[PDB]
Structure formats: C-alpha cells, structure tokens
Design a protein around this ligand. Structure first.
Ligand code: HEM
Ligand code: EW5
Length: 395
C-alpha cells in the first residue's frame, strides 16, 4: 500500500532513541522528510554530514526566517530575532554578552550549590515522592538565570511560565507566544530603566546603553537580549538537567560511581550531554546555494534539518554510542551545543549548572530512583525540547 513521506519528529520520548535513526543513518544519512507544517526538508543523521552542514554558513540560520521559505515550525519571535546573535555582533556587544554569561563570576558557583541544596532540603522535608523537574531542575535553572541576568529572584517564576508556550514547536502561529513575547519585552525594557539593576547581564547592558559608543544601538535589541538569553538558557538547562537525571537514575552503577568519585562528574556530564535527547527537532538551516551533501544535491532555498542525536549516536564517531563511557578520546566532540557559527554561547554555564545540580543531588539523595515505572513519564509534545511533564522520584 502506498505510504506518505516520512514525517518528523519521530518520537517525543527523551528516554530512548528510536531504531529508525540508526536505520536512516546507515541507509540514507541525508533523506527527504515532511515537517509538521507540511514542508519538505532534508534530514541529516550522520556525524560527518551533520558537521558539514553546521560548518558551512551557506546553510543559513538567518534565512530560515524569510517569508515563503519551507518551515520546520512557526516563528514564536519576530523574524529579525532569528538573527539575534548576528544583531548582537553587529552592535558591538558579543564580547560583553559572552563575558556576562560565564560561570566564572565570583560567588556564582556557591550560589548554585546553596540553591540546589536548599531545593533538595525542601524535598526531603516534604517526603517522597518528589518531582525533580518542577521542584528541582527548572527552579535551579530559573534561579541561576535571574542571578546571571542581575534581575530579582522573585521575578523568575513569572518569566519561566512564559516558556511552555515560547518554545513550542507548532505548525501555525501561536497567539499566546506574541502576548508573552511582548510582555517579557516590556519587563526587560523596564529593567534597563531600573536604577537598582547594576549587576549581571542586564546591569552591563544598562551601562553600555548609556555609553556614547552604543548610543545608536536600539532599545529593542537591548531588551531582546534579555528575553532571548533568559528563555534559551532556562529552557535549555532545565530540560537538559531533567533528562540527564533520568539517564543517571537508570544507571545505578554510574550513579554510585559519581557519588563515590565526584571528581568524575564533569566527564559524566559530558557523556550525558552526548546522549541527550533534549532537542526535539533537528537544527534548521536554509540553503543559499546548490550544495552537495552526501549523495544529494541540496538546492538553493531548501530546508535542511541537522539531527543532533543522529550525529551523537553515530557509531563511526562514538563507538558503542548508547553506553556512557567516561574515558572516550573525543569526549567534547559531540554536537549537543551545535557547531560552527551558531555554537551555543552558554555552553560553559550549562555544563556548570548540570555538574553542580548532579553533585548536590547525589550527596543529598544517594539512593535516588524513579518512583514510577519509566513508561509512566508523560512526554511533552509539539515542543522544541523533549521533557517529562513531571519526574517523580524517591530515595
Ligand atoms: C545544557 C544546556 C544547553 C544546551 C544543550 C544548548 C544547546 C544549544 C544548541 C544546540 C544551540 C545551536 C542552535 C543552532 O545552531 O541552530 C544553541 C544556541 C544558543 N544557545 Fe544554547 N544550550 C544550552 C544552554 C544555553 C544557555 C545557558 C544559554 C544562555 C544563557 C544559551 C543560549 C543560546 C543562544 C542565545 C543560542 C543561539 C546562538 C546563535 O544563534 O548563534 N544556551 N544552544
Ligand atoms: O523559539 C525560539 N528559538 C528557537 C528558534 C528556532 C528557529 N527559528 C527561530 C527560533 C525563541 C522563543 N523565544 C521567546 C521568548 C519569550 C517569549 C516568546 C518567545 N525566544 C527565542 C530565542 C532564544 C534565543 N535566540 C533566539 C530566539
């Protein structure tokens, strides 16, 4: 019987990779698929071809926003914001933004530890079961990014609640995404006018905004940096930590090893990054030229999707790809933070968030385990991340 073109994404589950991925990688490491909008796209699933695409700027992020382009999903931001980092660089702000979001600031790591330990103490006092997403990982992500941005901790929860819509992966425009975007922009604009905001990213942007060398950088861009970096950082670190905790809980031998030898946690987090399924869709790019990728000539104007778990579970680059092995010779060569022009600017902060969160969890709850059968986790659909709605644990 005739069938329709293969549809992406394959599965919203973040606890297992579908067998189809390895089948595609072996047989058709670049092949045509249909996205949720009805558009056709090239899905790339081998390490070699994923890295080729991400290292060639003629596969353009900014052009994915063009009117009439084949789309992975609907925009939840204004089209100019797709080029956010390019706008930050053109404004002379890239070095200052990067420096502000490093985990190297004095007292930042101790703040993370204190916050993690307080969250865990509250869960222990309340008694099992505990929800490690809603009452540990996501609050830790939110508190971290309020600190990094320099904004009041009490404003975190409301900003966080915008994100279950802001990072939807939808076939159609989302009215609530515009409401939340506009409200979050007003908030960050007020922060830039708030005299008591003098630390972190927003404190630095506030100063530069009044410096004559930035006098024609737009107030809209300054506010956009705050919204985009809070939102991307919080959704990415919260979702990554949550699904890493699942992979750790399902490996009691590894859990016990990292509990016994916490100095191995950075290597453990790097493997947890490699095997992480938090990105629900391939990374989108639009070809600006005719470019050969494997056996396919991609034509100008076509959509390409870079499947991160295709690359990261490729046995030709990571032998025994499904096994967490702390002594690989190429441990940071995974694509969990992307590659090339748009490599994640928060990579160091995301690493340290997960490292400290796990260190604290294993000390407080060394017997941590799922409180429900793993198939009972509820995986969020039509979202740019894969996450369980709740993560119930005991200890
Ligand atoms: C474990 C945590 C994180 C993961 C797994 C992650 C993942 C990624 C990936 C894969 C990309 C590349 C997207 C592409 O090329 O299309 C990216 C870009 C980006 N990330 Fe992260 N990220 C994390 C944490 C953060 C944090 C903490 C921040 C900010 C505080 C952040 C802000 C951004 C921004 C703004 C971009 C866009 C860069 C550009 O367009 O050039 N991310 N991230
Ligand atoms: O969807 C978002 N990014 C993924 C994307 C993928 C392909 N094409 C466009 C965008 C996104 C959503 N928000 C947002 C935040 C608060 C309220 C409403 C929306 N911010 C961003 C964002 C973060 C960092 N850099 C740029 C954009």
């Amino acid at each position: 019987t005739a069938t329709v073109l293969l549809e992406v994404p394959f599965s919203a589950r973040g606890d297992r990779i579908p067998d189809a991925v390895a089948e595609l990688r072996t047989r058709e490491p670049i092949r045509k698929v249909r996205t949720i909008t009805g558009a056709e796209a090239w899905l790339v699933s081998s390490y070699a071809l994923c890295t080729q695409v991400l290292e060639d700027r003629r596969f353009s992020m900014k052009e994915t926003a063009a009117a009439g382009a084949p789309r992975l999903n609907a925009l939840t931001v204004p089209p100019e914001v797709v080029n956010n980092m390019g706008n930050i660089a053109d404004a002379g702000l890239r070095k200052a933004v990067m420096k502000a979001i490093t985990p190297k600031a004095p007292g930042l790591e101790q703040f993370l530890r204190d916050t993690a330990n307080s969250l865990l103490d509250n869960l222990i006092t309340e008694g099992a079961p505990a929800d490690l997403r809603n009452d540990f990982a996501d609050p830790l992500a939110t508190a971290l990014h309020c600190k990094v941005l320099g904004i009041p901790q009490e404003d975190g929860p409301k900003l966080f609640r915008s994100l279950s819509i802001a990072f939807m992966s939808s076939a159609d425009p989302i009215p609530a995404a515009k409401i939340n975007w506009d409200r979050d922009i007003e908030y960050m604009a007020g922060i830039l006018e708030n005299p008591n905001i003098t630390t972190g990213l927003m404190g630095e942007l506030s100063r530069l905004r009044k410096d004559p060398a930035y006098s024609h950088v737009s107030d809209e861009l300054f506010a956009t940096i705050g919204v985009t970096f809070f939102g991307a950082g919080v959704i990415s670190t919260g979702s990554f930590l949550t699904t890493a905790l699942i992979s750790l809980i399902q490996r009691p031998q590894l859990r016990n090893l990292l509990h016994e030898k916490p100095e191995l946690i950075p290597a453990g987090v790097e493997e947890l990054l490699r095997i992480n399924l938090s990105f629900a869709d391939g990374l989108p790019r639009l070809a600006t030229a005719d470019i050969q990728v494997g056996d396919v000539l991609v034509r100008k104007g076509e959509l390409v999707l870079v499947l991160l778990e295709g690359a990261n579970f490729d046995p030709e680059h990571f032998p025994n790809p499904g096994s967490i092995e702390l002594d690989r010779p190429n441990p940071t060569s995974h694509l969990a933070f992307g590659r090339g022009q748009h490599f994640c600017p928060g990579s160091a902060l995301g690493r340290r968030h997960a490292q400290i969160g796990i260190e604290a969890l294993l000390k407080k709850m060394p017997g941590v385990d799922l409180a429900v059968p793993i198939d009972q986790l509820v995986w969020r659909t039509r979202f740019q991340r894969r996450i369980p709605e709740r993560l119930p644990v005991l200890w």
